[PDB]
Curated annotation (Swiss-Prot):
UniProt name for this protein: Synaptotagmin-13
Domain free text: The first C2 domain/C2A does not mediate Ca(2+)-dependent phospholipid binding.
GO molecular function: calcium ion sensor activity; calcium-dependent phospholipid binding; SNARE binding
The protein's assembly and partners: Interacts with NRXN1.
Boundaries of every C2 domain copy: 11-128
Known function: May be involved in transport vesicle docking to the plasma membrane.
Keywords, in A-Z order: Membrane, Repeat, Transmembrane, Transmembrane helix
Organism: Homo sapiens
Length: 138
C-alpha cells in the first residue's frame, strides 16, 4: 500500500440526528434526519445509515431513500438494538451512502457518536458534520 489523498473544500456535509435510548425498548434511536450537503452532479437516492456496535455484535439501520437536495429531511428515525449495559461499551456511527450499483464509494459521509452519554447527549437533537475523511469525489 502507498499513496493517499485529502481535501478541505469550503462547505462541509452536515447530518442531523436525534439520539434517544429507550431503556424500556433497550433500543437506540437516531431520528431527526436532516442532511445538509450543497452540491450538484447527477442524481442518486441518498439515505441515512446508523451503525451500532455492542459487546454482542453490531447493528445497522437506515431510512427511506430520498431525493438528494440542498437539505433533505426524513420523517422517521433509525433504531439500533443495544443494552443499557452496553451503552458505555457501544457506539453509534452514522453514514451517508448513495444508492448506486454497488455503492462505488463505500460511504459518502460518516459520523461518529456516543451512547454512553458523552459526545452527544440523549433526547438532545444536534447537528454534526460528516467525517467524509478524504476527497471521495473525482
Amino acid at each position: 500500500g502507498s499513496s493517499g489523498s485529502s481535501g478541505s473544500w469550503n462547505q462541509a456535509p452536515k447530518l442531523h440526528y436525534c439520539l434517544d435510548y429507550d431503556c424500556q425498548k433497550a433500543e437506540l434511536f437516531v431520528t431527526r434526519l436532516e442532511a445538509v450537503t450543497s452540491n450538484h452532479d447527477g442524481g442518486c437516492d441518498c439515505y441515512v445509515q446508523g451503525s451500532v456496535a455492542n459487546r454482542t455484535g453490531s447493528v445497522e439501520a437506515q431510512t427511506a431513500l430520498k431525493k438528494r437536495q440542498l437539505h433533505t429531511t426524513w420523517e422517521e428515525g433509525l433504531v439500533l438494538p443495544l443494552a443499557e449495559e452496553e451503552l458505555p461499551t457501544a457506539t453509534l456511527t452514522l453514514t451517508l451512502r448513495t444508492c448506486d450499483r454497488f455503492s462505488r464509494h463505500s460511504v459518502a459521509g460518516e459520523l461518529r457518536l456516543g451512547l454512553d452519554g458523552t459526545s452527544v447527549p440523549l433526547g438532545a437533537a444536534q447537528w454534526g458534520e460528516l467525517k467524509t475523511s478524504g476527497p471521495s469525489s473525482g
